[PDB]
Ligand binder design. Structure first.
Ligand SMILES: O=C(COc1ccc(Cl)cc1)N[C@H]1CC[C@H](NC(=O)COc2ccc(Cl)cc2)CC1
Lengths: 240, 318, 357, 275, 201, 357
């Protein structure tokens, strides 16, 4: 088997339907006979009994701890993963067919492949597929820095600022091997993105790729994107 | 005086910088207009003085652009017109000038109807369900094909040019008339030559031995046509016919900037490389089967007689 | 099930039987993300084949054999079934998917035939992992000799042919010709190479890079300028992709044309082909078995006058780019294989000494 | 609905006529005489040029208008021999101007007959004989006399009152003449940079502007406008632009003299050109 | 409207020493032709009508070099204006003498005296004219660049230029050089001022 | 007035612009019995043309000039009309009816051009019967010199070329070739002639008769055995029907084929063409301007198995017999005219000295 889909649960089904059902429908529509879903324990450690009341083909639900992040949940399922990891989340309303990000992961032999959609400045190569830089404006002392090697090997870098993270990743086995070997990472979205983006600026190296969709967008944990969840699900879940 | 000299200098600079104008027929018409504007606003007593003046101006006109031989052989045709008029009036100031003016007038009437005569005689060289091969872009072969497609149904393979794709506009102009145009690259010529029935092309300059310089890649096409024994057709007018021999004078090919072949964004390897781009190519007369002009069809073993009907051997050095 | 790819654009009437796909659409739009009916290594090979990332024939064969090693390493045996029949029955959908992704080169066909001959001769008394390790070692030894030992022998046989001060002409991108030129430049020969390239791949720039990083004086010209440079050229070196039964040279499209112009300029051409890239199937033209790439690759940015942009709106407009063509055997003089310098007329004879005969 | 251009149905000998080539034969080129109700003529193969001619189609250009001189005419046999060899470029330009004026008169009378709704060709020919051919016979000039009478009637309509065609036909002909041949409108614009960097700079600039405006002739007011601080636009909207350009040049020279008399520069940013 | 141009024929950087101590750097031959003649031929191939040559150091030598050239002839379509003064020593001083003399009218070209080019910039001139016509004289300068590789031997490490511009309306937001800089810093207000597109070149 | 003949059978798609008639039907089913729109001599000429009674080009031109003499003898002048273009306007329906009966040979086209040039240049001061007698005498003198004086000069130029004891190869049916062979046999040369023939006309037997009535030893062979006899044949004598501008030889279909086999056997060919059978019109193949004979002429009686009987019932069956073809100018060496032995490359040159220039 090529991929083992993991759905993350960090601080949930508040809407016109279950918020965990749409990633489960997106997985079970195309392939994915083996689905691993972690449970939430920071807000309340009782979402596993609500998640086990669905009607999917095969769900693997595990209990988790309260004080934990994304990298702790990656390191928690390390002895039960044997192949490439394809990370999901609860608040992920994606009308885009995710076959193309798997095509970007497979065709270029990439180590990481992510999907963004229209705070974070993302500088991508001029072809529009391979990312070269990404940074938030919070944890940066200066405005930005750019090395000379990434401008020598890639002389034009197109930057985007109105992007959101759909939390659709594709990880390689040695990346989570390094994550298990380096336990200082807590948030995988701020660690596996930035450290690999810095390590790609080394020949023999790793490749990180991203697709910029223009069809829909994901949701958020707060109530800022909760009003667009029902209006987005009333017109897109009819074909699903 | 002033107007003549500034028009001559603008003509020389326009031939020096780029292709001004686009079509060769308008260039020949403006060359006739420049020559008639020169001869109506000058003074001469003998015809040899006018001969030396036109020779001195034509030396500058060929030194401006040596690849554009249309102005050179047009100046040579005007010089032979001067020689024939002095010969027929010797055996002469206003009557001779009026005779030269009306000869240039009827030459312009002849020059305006070259393409319509070629399109009129296009019907006796194209049959139905035919495979046509054309390299480059010229309005003569385009009018040839678009008049032959008015009553016949056939197929044209328009091959593009590898330095700059000039065959794409010809392909999208022929496909608007519905001749089932097939577009391909330059590397497939022999790879299509086993199915090409007849090759119909144009040229830039008809040389004196029947040879021709033309757009690059057509010497390979003529070699493949000789290998596959398909007949070759040259739709060329009578002002692209020049007495300049191939190996006699230098600066045969026109070399242009190599940015169309290898771009400037290639890298550090552009210093240790030598990129050439010859836009013209030389085709020997043995690979040519038939020339088609407004007066009809001619063999490549007949072009010398056209020289004897249009040029003097004393004017070959200009 | 694996569906059929839709034929893109309007095909040529002479090429109605050959498929013409496009790179903007993929076959995996209706395929599972955990690849079950196709192997994940096989679908990765098909994805890197269809997008044009692996274009060389030796590189395609090497990546194909690596994907087959990944298939054999991830292979299991069903109950009451043998390996020597189930592996043959299971590899044929993989090769059909590979052919649907891109029309296969002849090196891939000979690799498929050699792998079928190897997995046919596996005895029933052998174990599973022992036969799998035997097949992996056989694939490793096969690719080892018939890539690098053949390349070293062909470069040694070409080193004693290239003299000092001559001009060599190359065409296209191939690892064997660039390795020959690099070993000849490093072993003592002083020469300059004329690089001839064609549209729309522009792959020769690739081998031009291996002619600059090695320190060789190089000249980069095109197909229409090949008739201009060939009066000065003394030798034409060619990279062969396939050699048919009659002595034909199946390679990149600007080869038999280049060989005809080189014969017309009295320049003897030199093709280099490993023995595993030979063919028992023979064709006499570029029209009965050929690859058709994208019809949208022919357009270029010449100012703001892209004429072939909306080419599908014109009903009487056909677009075509041939990948392969064959050469008449009276045009090519040398064939440099690891057994030596042969003519074209003995390229089936070598097959007779390489098909266990 | 058509007619001939003059009162004669056939041209005289050595009369240069404007024809268009319709077909090519071995004996010559069949043409149509555009100013004689499209009667068929023939330009001979021996008369197509003064040089040995290999083919008739090399200088024929079927579809092109050309001036040819009449060599032989036969009203009984219907044979009209034409020649391109005998005509001169000056005679060709004269025939082109005469054919242009006669075609303008033909279009004017055709518009007048279309306004009068005279569908019959005999009534239209009577309008022709009552309007243009009478003046052509009175002035003894075919084409020049009718166009000159119409150009005089566009200015002074007393010449059109002598025609006794009808009460409405004369008014329709006068309206067609004033709408077709009376386009007297031109605008000779010019730019002049007149200034003075001295004591009374603006005073000398206004004095030069008043001196330039005072030199404006009748029915041709040279209007000056401040297009820029150092540049000015001197326009002139009047007919007879060959005289209007000279009047604008004289006004610019007077303004330059008035600027140089008061110690000020006066450059010509643009010469007198029609808008 | 006519097309004016100014030509700074005196590069005020002390780089060609001691080559420029005998004849200036705009009179050196590339291939038997001085760079003044190359730049003037590029200007006549562009289509300018009048130029303004500015030269301070050894200006009499530049004047006697270019008076015997093709461009000082009365039959030349592009006239020249030789302006000689030893007071200015900077390009800004040249442009403020242009403003004090009021030579140019609208959309004039700016070129050094040692620029080798063959670009026809009528497309860029019409783009600058339409950008001035729509936005009411907001666009003031249209810089011109050539697509090149950073490893090319043309651009050296002393004159390498990195910019940060817009993608859809190509307005420049940042512009700097790499004169002894291994790490480049770009400002943050360029993203807040333009949230539609930005590209580092 | 004069309708068009219906095209018989299904035409070839490559010959769809050229007409294909049949000899079983005629146009005079829809014509008057006193022929008024066509002359009786002209409709007699068209009837003997369409049935295949006059097949030789010189015989066709002689019969055409006799029909034109009968037209001029029965010609009247209408009032207020000139002869110089009324005769042209009356001859054009006659030539159009002749073209509808059979596609005209080039000798007929040149005779039409010469007669139009003759009847154009008649003076207006001449009478009716005086101009008619002048035109008849001009036609008589023209056919007299440019048939028999040209034939005598061509036979005299061929007599000094044919040696004693050689072997001559001929093809087709023409009076000039038979006259050359008869004069060479009677003037002293001893030789034998191989008459090569082809289907379905079988006209060369006619020439074979004039080789037996003259006493010449002959050998009657066909075109597939022409490759067999040409090792023994030293000279090939052909009969040209038309010579184009580029030096091509438009003749019967077994000419360019026969010249190619003769060049492949080192046998130089010899065509014999009069000057009045030349062409300013040029063509490079047998496809743009050719005559199509009857499609039911290819069937024969080979026992009781006539396979091409009901050929029209098969929808995918095409029948074609070409009459004329052209040769490449590099295959033919001789052109024997009354001005001498020229190459093909000077056949427009003599046109320049025969078009009053
Ligand atoms: O369709 C095409 C298009 O040609 C090409 C278009 C593009 C390319 Cl890359 C290559 C070739 N050509 C046709 C032209 C008629 C021919 N012949 C026929 O249809 C009939 O065949 C005959 C039959 C009888 C005779 Cl005598 C001759 C040919 C087949 C091929």
């Amino acid at each position: 088997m090529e991929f083992q889909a993991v759905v993350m649960a960090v601080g949930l089904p508040v809407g016109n339907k279950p918020l965990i059902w749409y990633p489960l429908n997106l997985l079970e529509r195309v392939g994915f006979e083996e689905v691993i879903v972690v449970t939430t324990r920071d807000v309340q450690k009782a979402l596993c009994a609500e998640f086990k009341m669905k009607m999917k083909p095969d769900i693997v639900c595990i209990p988790d701890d309260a004080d934990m992040g994304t990298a702790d949940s990656l390191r928690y399922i390390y002895p039960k993963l044997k192949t490439d990891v394809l990370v999901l989340s609860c608040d992920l309303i994606t009308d885009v067919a995710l076959h193309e990000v798997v095509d970007l992961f497979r065709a270029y032999d990439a180590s990481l492949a992510m999907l963004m959609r229209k705070r974070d400045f993302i500088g991508v190569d001029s072809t529009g597929k391979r990312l070269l830089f990404m940074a938030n404006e919070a944890d940066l002392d200066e405005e930005l820095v750019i090395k000379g090697s990434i401008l020598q090997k890639h002389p034009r870098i197109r930057f985007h600022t109105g992007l959101v993270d759909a939390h659709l990743y594709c990880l390689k086995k040695y990346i989570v091997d390094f994550l298990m070997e380096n336990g200082s990472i807590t948030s995988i979205r701020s660690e596996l993105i930035p450290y690999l983006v810095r390590k790609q600026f080394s020949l023999k190296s790793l490749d990180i790729y991203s697709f910029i969709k223009e069809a829909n967008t994901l949701n958020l944990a707060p109530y800022d994107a909760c009003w667009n969840a029902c209006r987005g699900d009333r017109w897109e879940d009819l074909s699903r | 005086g002033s107007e003549l000299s500034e028009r001559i200098e603008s003509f020389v600079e326009t031939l020096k910088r780029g292709g001004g104008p686009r079509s060769s027929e308008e260039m020949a018409r403006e060359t006739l207009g420049l020559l008639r504007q020169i001869i109506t606003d000058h003074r001469w007593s003998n015809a040899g003085e006018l001969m030396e003046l036109i020779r001195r101006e034509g030396r500058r006109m060929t030194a401006a652009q040596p690849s554009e031989t249309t102005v050179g052989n047009m100046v040579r045709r005007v010089l032979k017109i001067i020689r024939e008029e002095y010969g027929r009036l010797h055996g002469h100031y206003a009557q001779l000038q009026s005779n030269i003016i009306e000869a240039i007038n009827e030459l312009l009437v002849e020059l305006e109807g070259t393409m319509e005569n070629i399109a009129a005689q296009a019907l006796e060289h194209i049959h139905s369900n035919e495979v046509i091969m054309t390299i480059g872009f010229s309005r003569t072969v385009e009018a040839f094909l678009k008049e032959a497609a008015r009553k016949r149904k056939f197929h044209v393979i328009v091959a593009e040019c590898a330095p700059f794709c000039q065959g794409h506009e010809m392909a999208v102009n022929l496909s608007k008339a519905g001749i089932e145009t097939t577009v391909m690259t330059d590397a497939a010529i022999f790879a299509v030559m086993s199915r090409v029935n007849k090759v119909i092309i144009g040229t830039k300059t008809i040389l004196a031995n029947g040879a021709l310089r033309a757009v690059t890649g057509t010497h390979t096409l003529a070699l493949a046509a000789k290998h596959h024994s398909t007949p070759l057709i040259v739709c060329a007018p009578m002002f692209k016919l020049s007495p300049q021999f191939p190996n006699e004078e230098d600066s045969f090919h026109k070399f242009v900037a190599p940015e169309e072949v290898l771009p400037f964004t290639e890298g550090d390897i552009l210093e240790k490389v030598s990129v050439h781009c010859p836009v013209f190519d030389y085709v020997p007369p043995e690979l040519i089967t038939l020339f088609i002009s407004n007066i009809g069809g001619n063999a490549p073993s007949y072009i010398y007689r056209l020289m004897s009907e249009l040029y003097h051997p004393d004017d070959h050095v200009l | 099930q694996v569906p059929t790819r839709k034929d893109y654009g309007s095909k040529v009437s002479l090429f109605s039987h050959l498929p013409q796909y496009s790179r903007q659409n993929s076959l995996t739009q209706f395929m599972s993300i955990p690849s079950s009916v196709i192997h994940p290594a096989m679908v990765r090979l098909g994805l890197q084949y269809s997008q044009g990332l692996v274009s060389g024939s030796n590189a395609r064969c090497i990546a194909l054999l690596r994907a087959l090693q990944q298939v054999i390493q991830d292979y299991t045996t069903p109950p009451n079934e043998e390996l020597s029949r189930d592996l043959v029955n299971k590899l044929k959908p993989y090769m059909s998917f590979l052919t649907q992704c891109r029309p296969l080169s002849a090196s891939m066909h000979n690799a498929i035939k050699f792998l079928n001959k190897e997995i046919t001769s596996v005895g029933s008394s052998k174990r599973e992992e022992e036969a799998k390790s035997e097949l992996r070692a056989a694939i490793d030894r096969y690719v080892q000799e018939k890539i690098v030992l053949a390349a070293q022998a062909i470069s040694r046989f070409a080193y004693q042919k290239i003299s000092n001060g001559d001009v060599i002409l190359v065409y296209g991108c191939s690892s064997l010709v660039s390795r020959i030129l690099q070993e000849a430049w490093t072993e003592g020969r002083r020469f300059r190479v004329v690089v001839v390239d064609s549209r729309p791949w522009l792959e020769g720039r690739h081998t031009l890079r291996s002619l600059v990083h090695a320190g060789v004086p190089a000249s980069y010209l095109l197909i229409p300028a090949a008739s201009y440079v060939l009066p000065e050229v003394s030798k034409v070196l060619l990279g062969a992709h396939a050699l048919l039964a009659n002595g034909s040279v199946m390679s990149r499209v600007g080869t038999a044309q280049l060989a005809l112009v080189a014969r017309a300029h009295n320049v003897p051409v030199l093709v280099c082909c490993e023995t595993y890239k030979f063919c028992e199937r023979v064709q006499t033209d570029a029209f009965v078995s050929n690859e058709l790439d994208d019809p949208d690759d022919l357009q270029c940015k010449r100012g703001e006058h892209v004429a072939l942009a909306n080419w599908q709106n014109h009903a009487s407009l056909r677009l075509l780019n041939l990948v392969y063509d064959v050469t008449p055997p009276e045009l090519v003089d040398l064939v440099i294989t690891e057994l030596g310098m042969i003519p074209c007329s003995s390229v089936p004879v070598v097959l007779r000494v390489k098909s266990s005969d | 609905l058509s007619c001939r251009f003059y009162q004669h149905k056939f041209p005289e000998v050595e009369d240069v006529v404007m024809v268009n080539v319709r077909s090519i034969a071995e004996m010559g080129a069949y043409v149509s005489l555009l100013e004689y109700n499209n009667i068929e003529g023939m330009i001979l193969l021996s008369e197509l040029s003064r040089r040995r001619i290999r083919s008739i189609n090399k200088l024929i250009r079927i579809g092109r208008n050309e001036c040819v001189v009449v060599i032989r005419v036969d009203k009984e046999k219907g044979y009209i021999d034409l020649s391109k060899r005998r005509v001169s470029p000056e005679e060709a330009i004269k025939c082109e101007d005469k054919f242009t004026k006669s075609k303008t008169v033909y279009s004017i009378l055709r518009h007048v007959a279309e306004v009068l709704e005279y569908t019959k060709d005999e009534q239209l020919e009577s309008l022709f004989q009552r309007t243009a051919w009478v003046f052509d016979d009175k002035y003894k000039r075919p084409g020049y006399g009718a166009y000159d009478a119409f150009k005089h009637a566009v200015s002074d309509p007393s010449i059109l009152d002598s025609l006794d065609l009808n009460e409405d036909e004369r008014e329709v002909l006068i309206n067609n003449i004033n709408r077709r041949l009376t386009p007297q409108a031109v605008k000779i614009r010019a730019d002049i940079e007149v200034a003075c960097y001295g004591y009374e700079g603006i005073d000398a600039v206004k004095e030069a502007l008043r001196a330039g405006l005072n030199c404006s002739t009748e029915n041709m007011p040279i209007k000056i406008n401040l297009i820029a601080p150092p540049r000015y636009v001197m326009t002139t909207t009047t007919l007879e632009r060959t005289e209007g350009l000279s009047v604008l040049s004289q006004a610019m020279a007077v303004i330059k003299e008035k600027i140089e008399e008061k110690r000020g520069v006066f450059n010509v940013q643009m010469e007198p050109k029609v808008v | 409207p006519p097309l004016q141009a100014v030509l700074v024929a005196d590069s005020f950087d002390r780089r060609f020493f001691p080559i420029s101590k005998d004849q200036p750097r705009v009179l050196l031959p590339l291939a038997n032709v001085a760079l003044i003649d190359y730049t003037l031929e590029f200007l006549t191939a562009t289509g300018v009508q009048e130029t303004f040559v500015f030269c301070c150091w050894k200006a009499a030598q530049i004047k006697e070099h270019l008076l015997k050239s093709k461009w000082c002839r009365p039959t030349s379509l592009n006239v020249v204006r030789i302006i000689t003064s030893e007071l200015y020593r900077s390009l800004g001083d040249v442009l403020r003498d242009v403003d004090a003399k009021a030579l140019v009218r609208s959309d004039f070209l700016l070129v050094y005296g040692d620029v080798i080019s063959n670009i026809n910039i009528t497309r860029a001139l019409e783009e600058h004219r339409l950008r001035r016509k729509l936005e009411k004289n907001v666009s003031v300068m249209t810089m011109i660049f050539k697509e090149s590789s950073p490893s090319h031997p043309t651009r050296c490490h002393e004159d390498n230029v990195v910019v940060a511009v817009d993608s859809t309306t190509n307005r420049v937001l940042h512009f700097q050089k790499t004169q002894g800089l291994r790490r480049f810093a770009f400002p943050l207000s360029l993203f807040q001022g333009s949230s539609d597109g930005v590209e580092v070149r």
